[model samples]
Target: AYFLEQTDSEIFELIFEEYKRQNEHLEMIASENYTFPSVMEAMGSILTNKYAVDKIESLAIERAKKLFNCQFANVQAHSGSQANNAVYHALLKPYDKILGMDGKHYQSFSYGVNLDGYIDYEEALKIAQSVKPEIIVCGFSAYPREIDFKKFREIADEVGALLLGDIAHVAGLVVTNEHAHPFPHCHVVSSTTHKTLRGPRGGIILTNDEEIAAKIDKAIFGPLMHVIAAKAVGFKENLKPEFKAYAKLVKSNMQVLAKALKEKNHKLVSGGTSNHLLLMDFLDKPYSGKDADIALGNAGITVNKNTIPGETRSPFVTSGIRIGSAALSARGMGAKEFEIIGNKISDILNDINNVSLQLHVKEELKAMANQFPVYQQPIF
Candidate 1:
């Protein structure tokens, strides 16, 4: 409350409001988490007073290197989007025949592309081969399956193009040995620390190649880095260490929840999850992602509507829900607890005849949440 008054920033206010909402509602939304009090304290540290250029930027980059196993890390970009923008801006000249498209992670060559959902590799490869694009971007926002970065790299090699893996959605899982790491194979890797990483919302760029890394550094620092705000910089530095631990926790909890959900007979997209989230297919369940998301939200089991691979419906009314154990795990729920909660979720959603079950589930959810505590105090 004191920090909120001191900052008096609408953004922070909104973030705090979101934190409040998450406390009130069940937060299964993929790409979201309840930051540990320690993480938030780190973000509120005085490190934001310095420009992220010399020593400050160096420390941030060094942290990225340790976490993601890359030789170069550009920690100045404000977001994964900006980090990508910097890399693209540096690598491609206007009208230089640059090709940036993604099929694995809902990426396309055209501007104004939706970053959410999965892109079909077959179609993406076909387009890349035909266009002979200069670069291919692979990865996604709401995608639930494990990706084959090597295959994308091979395709890029075949066409003499560069491959960029956007690990934004699964960076935490990747670091925790759950998702496929986009190191050595990808020419450049861009990710936000928040998504699966469970850190402050900021972007990072990593590359193994010295030359490419240098180019990305220049791209981000020169034109892109200048655009970030001081507070964001402070937040990023504080978030790194705190999120690294949260990232590891998210993976373990996700696996636990996935196993438990499977035990309750809910079909997960790709059979099960290899990371922090599992895509719930609505085919056998008889409800659209839209309805499921709403029902679960009502039941205090938060989640988002999403499309399955080869989905029949549009994005708004899809046949799947993207559920993660990230937030709940942050609250200290473990595999055993996840199993009990998973059965409750199945009962609430699957028992269509009794809509009152959702209310009952919410009661149980509140009781369960009371067992865990939110960040009591900030840590720096």
Candidate 2:
């Protein structure tokens, strides 16, 4: 009603409805975040109508290079997957062997390295020696532990392979020194600007090697210039001290959630997390992850069903769910809040068939949502 014609109000109403939905629920999805309004404003700016690579993109590139402490950074690729695709095209010939963790992205395209645990360096090293892949990818989507970039680099060196790190999930943590930096070890790196980075959805590629940098640029042709502009705004926001504090809170909230879940007798992959999310196993319970996912949604909680190691169920009906604290932490919830959420999750899983329990939990969830409301107060 503020600016739209009466006939054009439908779309505006739907967007408002979505905002209300987000405000009313617990968003536990691992790959999602509520970016600052500044980032969102940049994404919706008039720059989208143009196509030139200008100061915005250049500033984004410079900020990214400094943030990651890398020699080169490309803030262009539309998504993390696109950045990985560009890296593949830039670094390897078609059908070249790429060794990566099982159940991760690269394995979907090439060979996989089966780990003894979440990040088994010795096993990864042994597999690298045997497979002798052209490229070694050290990154993960759902694994809930830290990766040793140095060990991966050593493995790559021993087998004469290039090490590429996709730090999409932990890029913010890396910038805050809470996680390991891929530079000086990884030959090239790719990441998404969203997720824990709290930026608009886009991709970035970085490298210290001049040869690979050139190839990466030529391979991707840069990316959508509009996205680059938004990425620049996001990068500027990320450089602030408050953003570092936010990243630290994300990890702390994750730890709190993990501890709370474990105390409630829930099983977590790799025991717990050193990062922003937890991969929880539900095999011990009678319900499947699909069952829990649907049931949790009814309780105003949202999470994604996921497969665990040695999973016996189909992908549609996974044995686990991946829960993250980044989005909630960004909403200003702290460790104590996550602990309550974890316990609530346990209650729902334990009584998956209880409709009355679901309603009661939804009420509790709404109260928490009210206590820590986002976009409800004056924010500059």
| Candidate number of the best TM-score | 2
In angstroms, the error of model 2 at 242 is: 0.7
Where in model 2 is the C-alpha error above 4 Å? 5-7, 103-116, 222-225, 376-380
Q: What is the lDDT of every predicted structure here?
A: 0.69, 0.83
- Superposed model 1: Cα runs more than 4 Å off: 1-20, 48-52, 95-127, 222-249, 377-380
Error of 2 at 195 (Å): 1.1
Enumerate clash totals for all models, in the order shown. Answer: 2, 0
- If candidate 1 were superposed on the true structure by all CA atoms, what would the RMSD be? 5.4
Model 1 per-residue lDDT at 11: 67
TM-score of each: 0.80, 0.93
lDDT of 2 by residue, 68-107 (tens): 8989988768899999999998888766789887623443
